[PDB]
Structures are given as C-alpha cells and as structure tokens.
Write a protein that binds this ligand. Structure first.
Ligand SMILES: [Cl-]
Ligand SMILES: [Cl-]
Ligand SMILES: [Cl-]
Lengths: 209, 209, 209
C-alpha cells in the first residue's frame, strides 16, 4: 500500500586490486587511486546515496544529470569506487551494501503501487553529493525524487513549507522520474521532506481534480 | 486496422496559483509569469501540438530535440504553462485537454498495429512551435512523425510531392520515433502529409522488398 | 545455454535512387553522394560492424557514443548508406544483410540467458569504425560489448592478458550495455577477446562472491 518501502537489490560486485596502467589513464585516475571497487544495483538514487555514504566510511571516492528512479531499473546502475588499496575499497563496498539494503528507500505513493517517490534527508553529505553546485561538504540536505509533475508541485510545496533553498535545478527532459536537492538546516530539510511527501500523496490520490 | 486513430489520455493536472520566489528564479520565469499550469499525458507529439494551440487560446507560454512517439509512453510527458494569473493558466490547460482528446492524433500504419505515425497540418502556429528555427509565428506547417526508416523515406517523398521546405532537420539518434517539420502554404503542407502517409503505409505493408 | 549465438533480424529496407535536393542539403551529403540506402535492424553493434564491412565491399559510406546492445532492441537501429548510384548502394545493403545474418554475433553469458556479450575481432577496419579516434583505416581491432560492470572488469582483464591498447574510452552513462574498442596486432586482439570473454562468463556465473 501507500508509504510502504521498496527494497532494492545488489546485482553484481567485483574488486580490481591493481588497475591496468592504460586503463588508469583512460579513467583519469589520480596517482593515489590504485584499486577499484565495482558494484551494480537495480535502483538509481538509493545507490547514489549509498555511494556518498561510503566516502565518509572509507578512503574512497566515486570515479545530478544522471538516471533517477526506483527498482527495478532498465539496466545496471554501476558505481566505481577508487581507493589507495583493496582493503579501503572493500570497506567502501561493505558500506554501500549496508546502505542499499537498510538505508534510504523509495516508497509507494498510492495503494495501487503504480507510482513511487523518495523523500530523504542526508544529515551530513560526503564528497560525492557535495560535488553538486550549492552543496557544501558536511552540510545537511533534502534528497527528493518523484515523477516530473509530482516532483515540480512537491518542490514548490517544500520551498513554501520550510526554511530551505534549492541547491541547483535542471528541469525534466519525456522522463519517468526527476530529482531535486534542497539545502538548509537538518530540521528544515526534514520539514521539506514531509511537505514534499504530502504533495505527492495528494496527486497520487487525485491526479485530475 | 491501418489508419485507425490512437487516442491518448491525460494522466495528471495541477495549478500553482503563486510560484515560490526561489523556484521562480531557478525556472528563470519572466516577471509577468506569476502562475504555473502543470499537465502530464501519455503521448509525446500530440501533447506538444496541444501546448502550442494553448498559446493562441490563452495568455500562456510554455516554460525539437525532445522525445517523440505515440501512447503509451515510458513515463510522463510534462508541459508547464506559465501565465499572468490562475484564470489564464486554467484557460490554457482547458485548451490543451480539448486538443489532446479531440485534436491531432497518431494513426496505425498497418492492420497488425505494431507501427504508428503522425501526419498533421498546423494551419496557424503559435509561440511554441514557431520557436523552432525556420518556423515563423502564424505560418502553417506539416508535423510528421514515424519510425526512423519510415520517417526518412517519407520526408524525401513529401519534399518531392509538394511545394514544401524542411524547416530544420536533426537526424535520428537507436530510436523508435523521429520527427520532421515542413514549411510552405497550407495546401502544400496537406499534400506533403498525404505523400508522407503513402510512403509509411507502403513500408508498413512490405518492409523488405 | 552459455556461449550460444544470438541471431538478429533485418526489420526494413529501402533505396532512394535520387535524394531530394533540399533533403540532401539538410543531410549535408557530399556532391558525389547521389543515392541513399536505408536499412533497419533489431541489434545495435552487429549492425554497426556490418555497416563498416559494407564500406570495403561497395562504394558507400555511412551518412562510438551511440546505443549498444543485443537484439531485440527498444526501437529501430537505422543505418543510411550513401553512394554514387543505386547499384553501389544495393551492393552495400547486400553486404550488410549477409553480415547481419552470418557475421559477428552476441552470445549468452550464462545458461539462464539474462545477460549477453560481444567479443569480436575486426581483422581489417573500413571507413566507419576507423572514424573513431585511435583507429587507423585498415588496422585490426577488438570490438567488446557487455553490461557496464562486466565490461569494465573485462576491459581491465583484456589489457592485462594481451599486447593491446584502448583506442578510446568513454565511461558508462544507468545503461544496459557499454562498448570498448581495443587496438593492436590481429593475434593480440584475439587474445584480448578470449580474456574479455572469460571475465564476463566468470561474473555471469558468480556475480556476488
Ligand atoms: Cl567522491
Ligand atoms: Cl511558448
Ligand atoms: Cl563511412
């Protein structure tokens, strides 16, 4: 039913202990990045949040305008974690696995379960999400995802309900899911997530008034 | 069967009476644009034509290289209508609804109904379709859509049969539907639509000679 | 089962004996290109290889960062062959047909047949594949395609096993299939294809260790 969690899955995982030199150049890896962790999953934004969380928990970095939406996805969502040795890379992958299976999650917008949404607060951003313009390393953030009409209406509602700012905005392309990042205090990001959720549920209930 | 109409549907609709100031800046709305109409449908090009028609019927504007094809689409096709007040915005949405449900339409190219096409004359363009290079505000236009091989062959056939010009051309990306806009007198655009249709039916009948 | 061939199909074909002048300008055709061959198929990379092969077998040319993957595809994969007359164009299309139906092929990575891959050596490149940076006209080449995690791991394995170089690399976008082109001697490209295949089979067997 409405507000029940969707739980994604990890589809494949491998570690490259020592990247080939020619491949390292083509990937433009920094000299300190020797090893590479590869993980694929069937959800877009939950994987992205898990990746950012890994950057705080291990000595790894990820090697905005991407695909967004819940599981199952059309294909593989791949993240490449780069690190100084295979142990740090494995620590990063373990953090990602843990957060994909028991971290942020999409929810159903209605009882029919034809529409989903994500409304999640990242209390402290790592190096991946803070790469976006307007998001500072360590600051909190509201991560909002919905179908484009619901997203637009919800974003407007969130900005009106809470003391938050739109970090950056790129409008929807035909797409199935669009995302938005809001910035402000931790409590204000929570209020924005609650207001975003109410707007999405309202439209999912009665899409044509 | 062949030439029967496909009828799309409106999936969701909302009006924002007064857009949040921060959101207005991110959407780069002109100062006279105070209100916002949101409508989503399951067809690409029929919705786009309906949007252009709304710009003539109300004081609204839409806030080429997009998705093209018939219903049902993979996700939501969203249009945002911007206007000076909620009454004009509602007038625009009412015009769109009317033209989505009884205006331009895709048709089946064969009796098996595995392939569709659009061949429609816009007798007087509004401000949305005339934003394309080579299309002048108020002038007529042939709006042609088909699968990429059929589209290419049909466009060549249309240009040969009627006194029309290719307004602008971007080749197909793997895609399922590509579009073309032709320019000329109202009668010449009609002849181009008839010739485009004949070529599509011919290929849909006997794709490999 | 694993390593069994996937066989694609030709979906539609037409020849334009004499391209309309306005259409020729929009397609930016050279003055010697008078005729146009249109062919659509349900596989991405097998069609691309067939197109390159046609450039050696006929007086035609094709009018990297495209769609990749096996059949069936979401829509039509179109190739336009441009040539000096309809006879040369027909010779090009006949070469493409022959190579789509009995040339390069994707294979299943596992017995469940949920994942496919392509590992093929082009012994002598024509004018189409050699348009890529780092590929010289007439030189051999390894053409590698797999799902993004398998592709990444396989490319690293290929570079380590054989005396080959990565011609050019663009990382995966959410995607279902990514491609890589390797350069070197004919025998070294074969060894790279064998090593790429072993890595893909290994992951397809045991994706999570
Ligand atoms: Cl990072
Ligand atoms: Cl407009
Ligand atoms: Cl070529």
């Amino acid at each position: 039913p409405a507000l029940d969690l969707i739980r994604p899955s990890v589809t494949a995982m491998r570690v490259i202990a020592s990247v080939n030199a020619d491949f390292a150049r083509e990937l433009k890896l920094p000299p300190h990045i020797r090893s590479l962790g590869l993980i694929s999953a069937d959800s877009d934004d939950v994987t992205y949040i898990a990746a950012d969380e890994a950057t705080k928990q291990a000595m790894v970095e990820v090697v905005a305008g991407a695909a967004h939406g819940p599981s199952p996805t059309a294909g593989e969502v791949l993240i490449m974690l780069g690190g100084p040795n295979p142990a740090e890379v494995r620590a990063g992958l373990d953090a990602m696995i843990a957060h994909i299976e028991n971290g942020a999650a999409f929810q159903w917008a209605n009882d029919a379960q034809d529409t989903a949404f994500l409304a999640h607060v990242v209390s402290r951003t790592g190096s991946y999400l803070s790469s976006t313009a307007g998001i500072t390393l360590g600051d909190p953030m509201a991560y909002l995802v919905a179908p484009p009409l619901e997203a637009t209406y919800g974003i407007d509602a969130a900005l009106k309900s809470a003391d938050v700012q739109l970090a950056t905005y790129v409008p929807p392309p035909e797409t199935n899911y669009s995302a938005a990042f809001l910035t402000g205090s931790q409590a204000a990001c929570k209020a924005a997530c609650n207001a975003f959720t109410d707007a999405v549920l309202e439209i999912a209930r009665n899409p044509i008034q």
